[PDB]
Amino acid sequence: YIKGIAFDLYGTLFDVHSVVGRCDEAFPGRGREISALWRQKQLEYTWLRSLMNRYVNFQQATEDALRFTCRHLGLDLDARTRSTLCDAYLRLAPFSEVPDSLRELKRRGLKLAILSNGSPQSIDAVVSHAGLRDGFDHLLSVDPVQVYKPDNRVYELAEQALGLDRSAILFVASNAWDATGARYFGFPTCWINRTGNVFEEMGQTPDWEVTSLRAVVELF
Amino acid sequence: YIKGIAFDLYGTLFDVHSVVGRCDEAFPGRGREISALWRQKQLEYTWLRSLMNRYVNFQQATEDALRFTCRHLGLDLDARTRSTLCDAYLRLAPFSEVPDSLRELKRRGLKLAILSNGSPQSIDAVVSHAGLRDGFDHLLSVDPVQVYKPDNRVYELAEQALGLDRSAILFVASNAWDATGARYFGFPTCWINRTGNVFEEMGQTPDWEVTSLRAVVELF
């Protein structure tokens, strides 16, 4: 039934925990605090700007979210440190099972795509850096539609880019709010729950809840 | 210039801190923790459901958000406690300056309106309970437009209900993300910052930043 798979990038295939460390190096002892807030503001800003119809790209939203975090915590953030922390996203490392799992999925003749927030160039840098670039048929950004998830215009992009009806595309995401959007859209959804989180209470439940990509491979 | 004022309810005119206590009584020692998460999920659910075009009223969103908080914390939440905590919002107390400030503003011939998320009946209960019901020309809910702020359809409601152009309506809100939306819409905006928060980094700045309603009265 499923002929393609759409993956979220940050937090699903690639571990963002490394940013915590780069944050702690910039502001010793503050790392975890800074990252938690930074991540949250990035999210809120994508949702809020979408609702207001005031789109700016993810790099912009990321800087704005860091600028806020720093003002909010009282930290002095110069331009240099700003760029350096923001660059931490281009050097993420994949989760242990990811590489082998991707190889196996491709060997099964499945079309694999990534649908993320960053530019196609940034998405490319992360996957290429990990040597996984050859494993994807498509590297998609929300940028062309000028809106963020869970706006349906974003999900239609994956459907179009992959050339398959939504019912034949497996949507794989770590974020429960994202899995909720995809489910309402029509994608058979797989929620990757590695750390014991509970699903969002927005009227949906994923088709599959797995602890890693290993369980995805075993679905085929 | 300004002939009317649109006020947000929870957190602007009425103190929600009382919910913390009712939460701690239900789950001793957990109060602050439960409330912080509950408040955050209410917000996220209003934004997310709007983006997905999956509207449910605020009472619903509030229950869903509490149900999630409880599952997330491991707390056992029965129906009774659910209703009781949810009812805590109908018995809020206004901030000290609020009553006198409202009296003074009305004495100046200004049209006063409240634009909140809850039903007109719930909004009425809170204001009536505090004996402030006679102080408002309009008690507005987002319900008629089936979407939440910062969606512009919500702001147009206030403009229509008050019978004034947006340029003549002062938008007063405690939430910086809300003040940002109103500003992009066209309302001269007053941000009530009582506890030293910093403004959101979404490209806007309020026209006035005050520490309480006392400074609002002094504007006229």
Curated annotation (Swiss-Prot), chains A, B:
Keywords linked to the UniProt accession? Hydrolase
Specify the effect of residue 8 to E/S/A/G.
Loss of catalytic activity
Specify whether Cell division is a keyword of the entry: no
Q: Where is this region: Important for catalytic activity?
A: 173-178
Query: Which molecular function term from Gene Ontology is one that the record holds?
Result: (S)-2-haloacid dehalogenase activity
Indicate the residues that form the catalytic site.
Answer: 8 (nucleophile)
Q: What is the effect of changing residue 155 to C/S/H/W?
A: Severe reduction in catalytic activity
Enumerate the PANTHER family for this protein: HALOACID DEHALOGENASE, TYPE II (AFU_ORTHOLOGUE AFUA_2G07750)-RELATED, HYDROLASE, HALOACID DELAHOGENASE-RELATED
Please give the name of this protein.
(S)-2-haloacid dehalogenase
Q: Can you name the source organism?
A: Pseudomonas sp. (strain YL)
